Amino acid sequence: KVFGRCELAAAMKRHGLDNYRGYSLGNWVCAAKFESNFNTQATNRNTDGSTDYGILQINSRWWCNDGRTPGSRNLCNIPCSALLSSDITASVNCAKKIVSDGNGMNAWVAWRNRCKGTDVQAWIRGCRL
Numbered sequence: 001k002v003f004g005r006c007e008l009a010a011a012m013k014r015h016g017l018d019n020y021r022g023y024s025l026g027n028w029v030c031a032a033k034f035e036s037n038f039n040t041q042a043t044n045r046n047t048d049g050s051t052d053y054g055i056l057q058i059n060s061r062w063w064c065n066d067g068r069t070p071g072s073r074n075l076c077n078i079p080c081s082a083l084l085s086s087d088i089t090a091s092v093n094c095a096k097k098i099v100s101d102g103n104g105m106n107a108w109v110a111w112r113n114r115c116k117g118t119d120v121q122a123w124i125r126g127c128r129l
Helices: 005-014 025-036 080-084 089-099 109-114 120-124
Strands: 043-045 051-053
Touching: 005 025, 005 120, 025 109, 025 120, 051 080, 080 089
Parallel strands: none
Antiparallel strands: 043 051
């Protein structure tokens, strides 16, 4: 599913990401924009043989099992395919674990490079939330 911006904002909010670990909703929307362009089906292979999955491009070395990433830890206890659903529940639950891991949203290099330090509230402008 390709979410609209406000559509995704409302879903993320509903699932409790607004202000989760102190990151306001615009941070999560901005991260999704630059990781996946709001597309739940996005996948991208990495050089180490892992793959990133879903709206928040969560990685198969640590977080989810894709059956092809040796020394996978599956810390979210999910198949990576669950992160591709139109239902963002699995992505949100796993994102909550990731952002709790110590480096906050710096875990998402696209957030660090295109969101951190910017006016992230812009990403929820115009939305009825």
